Write an enzyme that holds these catalytic residues in place. Structure first.
Site, PDB file in Angstrom:
ATOM      1  N   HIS A   1       0.871  -1.228   0.000  1.00  0.00           N
ATOM      2  CA  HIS A   1       0.000   0.000   0.000  1.00  0.00           C
ATOM      3  C   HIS A   1       0.889   1.254   0.000  1.00  0.00           C
ATOM      4  CE1 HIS A   1      -3.291  -2.813   0.710  1.00  0.00           C
ATOM      5  NE2 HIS A   1      -2.672  -3.204   1.879  1.00  0.00           N
TER       6      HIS A   1
ATOM      7  N   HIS B   1       4.806   6.976   7.193  1.00  0.00           N
ATOM      8  CA  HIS B   1       4.603   6.591   5.807  1.00  0.00           C
ATOM      9  C   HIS B   1       4.107   7.798   5.033  1.00  0.00           C
ATOM     10  CE1 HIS B   1       0.713   6.146   7.656  1.00  0.00           C
ATOM     11  NE2 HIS B   1       0.269   6.575   6.473  1.00  0.00           N
TER      12      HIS B   1
ATOM     13  N   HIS C   1       1.607   9.129   1.415  1.00  0.00           N
ATOM     14  CA  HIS C   1       0.659   8.915   0.313  1.00  0.00           C
ATOM     15  C   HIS C   1       1.069   9.880  -0.800  1.00  0.00           C
ATOM     16  CE1 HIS C   1      -2.139   6.857   3.192  1.00  0.00           C
ATOM     17  NE2 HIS C   1      -1.506   7.636   4.042  1.00  0.00           N
TER      18      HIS C   1
ATOM     19  N   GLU D   1      -3.925  13.395   0.958  1.00  0.00           N
ATOM     20  CA  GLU D   1      -5.205  12.882   1.462  1.00  0.00           C
ATOM     21  C   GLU D   1      -6.037  14.079   1.936  1.00  0.00           C
ATOM     22  OE1 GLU D   1      -4.295   9.321   3.936  1.00  0.00           O
ATOM     23  OE2 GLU D   1      -5.014   8.391   2.052  1.00  0.00           O
TER      24      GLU D   1
ATOM     25  N   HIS E   1       2.594  11.007   7.001  1.00  0.00           N
ATOM     26  CA  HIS E   1       1.878  10.679   8.234  1.00  0.00           C
ATOM     27  C   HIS E   1       2.847  10.100   9.247  1.00  0.00           C
ATOM     28  CE1 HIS E   1      -2.150  10.425   5.862  1.00  0.00           C
ATOM     29  NE2 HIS E   1      -1.783  11.685   6.178  1.00  0.00           N
TER      30      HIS E   1
ATOM     31  N   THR F   1      -6.999   6.388   7.525  1.00  0.00           N
ATOM     32  CA  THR F   1      -7.386   6.620   6.142  1.00  0.00           C
ATOM     33  C   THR F   1      -7.277   5.380   5.275  1.00  0.00           C
ATOM     34  OG1 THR F   1      -5.250   7.309   5.305  1.00  0.00           O
ATOM     35  CG2 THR F   1      -6.731   9.057   6.291  1.00  0.00           C
ATOM     36  N   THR F   2      -6.919   4.241   5.861  1.00  0.00           N
ATOM     37  CA  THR F   2      -6.922   2.939   5.159  1.00  0.00           C
ATOM     38  C   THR F   2      -7.782   2.020   5.993  1.00  0.00           C
ATOM     39  OG1 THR F   2      -4.970   2.098   6.281  1.00  0.00           O
ATOM     40  CG2 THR F   2      -4.650   3.220   4.182  1.00  0.00           C
TER      41      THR F   2
HETATM   42  N1  LIG Z   1      -3.005   6.679   6.907  1.00  0.00           N
HETATM   43  S1  LIG Z   1      -3.116   6.737   8.480  1.00  0.00           S
HETATM   44  O1  LIG Z   1      -2.046   7.514   9.028  1.00  0.00           O
HETATM   45  O2  LIG Z   1      -4.454   7.137   8.834  1.00  0.00           O
HETATM   46  C1  LIG Z   1      -2.903   5.114   9.139  1.00  0.00           C
HETATM   47  C2  LIG Z   1      -3.529   4.016   8.563  1.00  0.00           C
HETATM   48  C3  LIG Z   1      -3.334   2.755   9.128  1.00  0.00           C
HETATM   49  C4  LIG Z   1      -2.558   2.582  10.264  1.00  0.00           C
HETATM   50  C5  LIG Z   1      -2.384   1.221  10.879  1.00  0.00           C
HETATM   51  C6  LIG Z   1      -0.989   0.772  10.459  1.00  0.00           C
HETATM   52  N2  LIG Z   1      -0.619  -0.567  10.929  1.00  0.00           N
HETATM   53  C7  LIG Z   1      -1.009  -1.607  10.140  1.00  0.00           C
HETATM   54  O3  LIG Z   1      -1.826  -1.408   9.250  1.00  0.00           O
HETATM   55  C8  LIG Z   1      -0.439  -2.998  10.320  1.00  0.00           C
HETATM   56 CL1  LIG Z   1       1.256  -3.077   9.758  1.00  0.00          CL
HETATM   57  C9  LIG Z   1       0.196  -0.770  12.152  1.00  0.00           C
HETATM   58  C10 LIG Z   1       1.704  -0.606  11.865  1.00  0.00           C
HETATM   59  O4  LIG Z   1       2.094   0.264  11.099  1.00  0.00           O
HETATM   60  N3  LIG Z   1       2.552  -1.366  12.549  1.00  0.00           N
HETATM   61  C11 LIG Z   1       3.991  -1.351  12.279  1.00  0.00           C
HETATM   62  C12 LIG Z   1       4.765  -1.546  13.557  1.00  0.00           C
HETATM   63  C13 LIG Z   1       4.514  -2.689  14.323  1.00  0.00           C
HETATM   64  C14 LIG Z   1       5.176  -2.896  15.520  1.00  0.00           C
HETATM   65  C15 LIG Z   1       6.100  -1.959  15.976  1.00  0.00           C
HETATM   66  C16 LIG Z   1       6.355  -0.814  15.217  1.00  0.00           C
HETATM   67  C17 LIG Z   1       5.699  -0.614  14.014  1.00  0.00           C
HETATM   68  C18 LIG Z   1      -0.270   0.088  13.306  1.00  0.00           C
HETATM   69  C19 LIG Z   1      -1.268  -0.377  14.148  1.00  0.00           C
HETATM   70  C20 LIG Z   1      -1.762   0.422  15.163  1.00  0.00           C
HETATM   71  C21 LIG Z   1      -1.270   1.720  15.352  1.00  0.00           C
HETATM   72  C22 LIG Z   1      -0.282   2.191  14.529  1.00  0.00           C
HETATM   73  C23 LIG Z   1       0.222   1.384  13.507  1.00  0.00           C
HETATM   74  C24 LIG Z   1      -1.948   3.692  10.812  1.00  0.00           C
HETATM   75  C25 LIG Z   1      -2.116   4.950  10.271  1.00  0.00           C
HETATM   76 ZN    ZN Z   2      -1.452   7.574   6.083  1.00  0.00          ZN
END
Ligand code: A1IWH
Ligand code: ZN
EC number: 4.2.1.1
Length: 258
Positions: A62, A92, A94, A104, A117, A196-197
């Protein structure tokens, strides 16, 4: 048939597996600069990244995530609209296929070339998986990117992307200083929203900086050489990995600045 950003699995389809996509506090949103109100009760944001410990960079199919050690408080976000302490876990981006799209959030309907972000979790909930189940579980610091002068502090990220071209690839990414990604000003907008995902959880306090950072055309071109696909699959360039603006509903966007 997993979610993504194609014609067949993009944002307009997400509601079928994640009905919260049509919820009351979805992100991103348009920031109408003439409607956002200065709130004198907000505080100066405190971004404390001196002791940040980056570990790894991952292409998750993604975007790419730079992950940090969150096993103690080192890199933390406090202040502003936030109560308590939020630990940096990952950042990360976008971005778009062309410089006229990619962000976004929008500002008076303007789309920036990309959006950074910085994701932080509220340490009062003990782990990030518990935090995302709470309305105040996460704080995401959003930073717009426009194309112009290179961002020196971004080049280490750019130069490792060749090593994580495809989904599921990762690389060691120690000793990266995320301070190098910030603008000069910490002036911001804030509102309550969501991831946002998928899974689109309504757990985020959004803090969106008003001042964009400048990156070079060559820097963002290298983002656009990444792949959504895994190794040995048909190439699909990682571009346009942004969700469009969602309805504001019963929310107010507050400004930190007069
Ligand atoms: N675009 S946005 O900013 O709105 C956005 C969208 C989705 C997420 C969740 C994002 N997320 C996952 O999807 C699953 Cl990999 C998690 C994540 O990054 N984890 C990586 C990590 C794990 C352990 C230690 C250190 C880092 C994870 C799980 C919970 C909290 C934070 C990150 C975060 C942010
Ligand atoms: Zn994001």
């Amino acid at each position: 048939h997993h979610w993504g950003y194609g014609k067949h699995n993009g944002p307009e389809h997400w509601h079928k597996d994640f009905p919260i996509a049509k919820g009351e506090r979805q992100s991103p949103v348009d920031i109408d600069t003439h409607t956002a109100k200065y709130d004198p009760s907000l505080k100066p944001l405190s971004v404390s990244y001196d002791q940040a410990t980056s570990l790894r960079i991952l292409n998750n199919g993604h975007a790419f995530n730079v992950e940090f050690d969150d096993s103690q408080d080192k890199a933390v976000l406090k202040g502003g609209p936030l109560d308590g302490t939020y630990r940096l876990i990952q950042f990360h981006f976008h971005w778009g296929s062309l410089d006229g799209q990619g962000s976004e959030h929008t500002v008076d309907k303007k789309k920036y070339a990309a959006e950074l972000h910085l994701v932080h979790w509220n340490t009062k909930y003990g782990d990030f998986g518990k935090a995302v189940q709470q309305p105040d579980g996460l704080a995401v610091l959003g930073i717009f990117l426009k194309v112009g002068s290179a961002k020196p502090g971004l080049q280490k990220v750019v130069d490792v992307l060749d090593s994580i071209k495809t989904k599921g690839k990762s690389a060691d990414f120690t000793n990266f200083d995320p301070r190098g990604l910030l603008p000069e000003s910490l002036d911001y907008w804030t509102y309550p929203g969501s991831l946002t995902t998928p899974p689109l959880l309504e757990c985020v306090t959004w803090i969106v900086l008003k001042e964009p950072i400048s990156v070079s055309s060559e820097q963002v071109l290298k983002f656009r050489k990444l792949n959504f696909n895994g190794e040995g699959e048909p190439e699909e360039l990682m571009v346009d990995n942004w969700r469009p603006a969602q309805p504001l509903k019963n929310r107010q966007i507050k400004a930190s600045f007069k």
